Design a protein around this ligand. Structure first.
Ligand SMILES: OC[C@H]1O[C@H](O[C@H]2[C@@H](O)[C@H](O)[C@@H](CO)O[C@@H]2O)[C@@H](O)[C@@H](O)[C@@H]1O
Ligand SMILES: OC[C@H]1O[C@H](O[C@@H]2C=CO[C@H](CO)[C@H]2O)[C@@H](O)[C@@H](O)[C@@H]1O
Length: 348
């Protein structure tokens, strides 16, 4: 078929499975969230957002309400939203919780994804004492456990992982895992993978980091333009040229906006207004114009940071007046994602 409705498997949408309900999880996990103290005096008592119907840890309000990430009926709905958005890859946050509830949820997500031909890759988070040895062990575990699942993502035969805050690990350690000669290499093994590191700051720092660490590519994550060098879209043409010259895969991250002031009240300078979709349009256009081979979307459902494309509805409670999609309908960001996926494919 040539309908212009099919999923794109070079489009990765960052997905968060950390939401809970009292009924399913025993707590409204993540809808309740600590308020961060301002990093710039002592004796702050910032408190917590309680995750009641009236007061959740987002400046927006989900169409699906305070949902559980373990609810198979929510997962079905999410996969139908990925189909509407044409986003073929779900990039799943992974915190190495080592608990049965995590294992269950990952299986449910893979199963629901496969029904709609969506693929799943892992976004490896900065879990406690993360290092290249336990990363290797965990890559082995994930490939062993999930590699034969029909929804497990591969690109030209290789799994792909995004590595958040990869700068927390020195290139000399990364080399041991990712150089073909590394002491604990995954290259040429059953556990080889495309490893996509986080490009943060200026080229003088990031170019040698990426080369010396032997990453296969890099992404930028942040939905807020200008937050880092890497999340400044006017740099993307030059970042892509460097990537192509050095055999690296650049996967710029685009998002519809940013606001996290319910959980970080002091972080207002990072707010990026959605402007009825114009912000998203501008950022997505820049990624496509850079001539990249793959794009990542921040985010499907990072509700705390206001980067979500998941449908949101107007809501005013006694405790908070939420933002909403304004003149646009709740599913606008899903259908606008599909529009941009089409433009990306036309360019590929
Ligand atoms: O603006 C807040 C910011 O917090 C988090 O990012 C932190 C860290 O993980 C990043 O590597 C650096 C990059 O300079 O910034 C912070 O210290 C994320 O939650 C991010 O989405 C958010 O914007
Ligand atoms: O937004 C609150 C959230 O912040 C941290 O998680 C990061 C936020 C966004 O994306 C990256 C990459 O997926 C996450 O690592 C962390 O402090 C969470 O506990 C917190 O809920």
């Amino acid at each position: 078929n040539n309908l212009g409705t099919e999923l794109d498997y070079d489009t990765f949408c960052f997905y968060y499975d950390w939401y809970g309900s009292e009924a399913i999880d025993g707590q409204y996990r993540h809808w309740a969230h600590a308020i961060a103290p301002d990093p710039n005096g002592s004796g702050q008592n910032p408190g917590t957002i309680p995750g009641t119907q009236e007061s959740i840890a987002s400046n927006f309000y989900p169409q699906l309400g305070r949902y559980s990430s373990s609810d198979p009926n929510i997962l079905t709905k999410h996969m139908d939203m990925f189909v509407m958005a044409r986003t073929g890859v779900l990039a799943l946050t992974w915190w190495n919780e080592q608990d049965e509830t995590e294992a269950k949820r990952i299986g449910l997500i893979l199963d629901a994804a496969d029904k709609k031909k969506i693929k799943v890759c892992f976004h490896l988070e900065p879990y406690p004492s993360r290092n290249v040895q336990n990363l290797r062990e965990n890559i082995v575990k994930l490939i062993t456990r999930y590699g034969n699942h029909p929804a497990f993502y591969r690109k030209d035969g290789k799994p792909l992982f995004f590595i958040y805050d990869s700068y927390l690990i020195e290139p000399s350690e990364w080399e041991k895992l990712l150089s073909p000669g590394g002491s604990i290499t995954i290259r040429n093994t059953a556990y080889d993978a495309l490893m996509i590191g986080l490009w943060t700051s200026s080229p003088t720092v990031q170019r040698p980091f990426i080369l010396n660490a032997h990453f296969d590519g890099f992404y930028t994550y942040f939905a807020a333009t200008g937050f880092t060098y890497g999340s400044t879209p006017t740099n993307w043409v030059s970042m892509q040229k460097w990537a192509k010259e050095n055999g690296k895969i650049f996967i710029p991250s685009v998002g519809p906006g940013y606001i996290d002031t319910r959980i970080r009240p002091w972080n207002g300078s990072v707010i990026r207004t959605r402007t009825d979709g114009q912000y998203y349009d501008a950022m997505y256009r820049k990624a496509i114009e850079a001539g990249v081979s793959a794009i990542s979307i921040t985010s499907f459902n990072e509700w705390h940071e206001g980067s979500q494309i998941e449908p949101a509805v107007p809501y005013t409670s006694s405790e908070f007046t939420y933002l909403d999609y304004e003149n646009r309908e709740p599913d606008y960001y899903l259908t606008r994602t599909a529009y941009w996926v089409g433009k990306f494919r036309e360019s590929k």
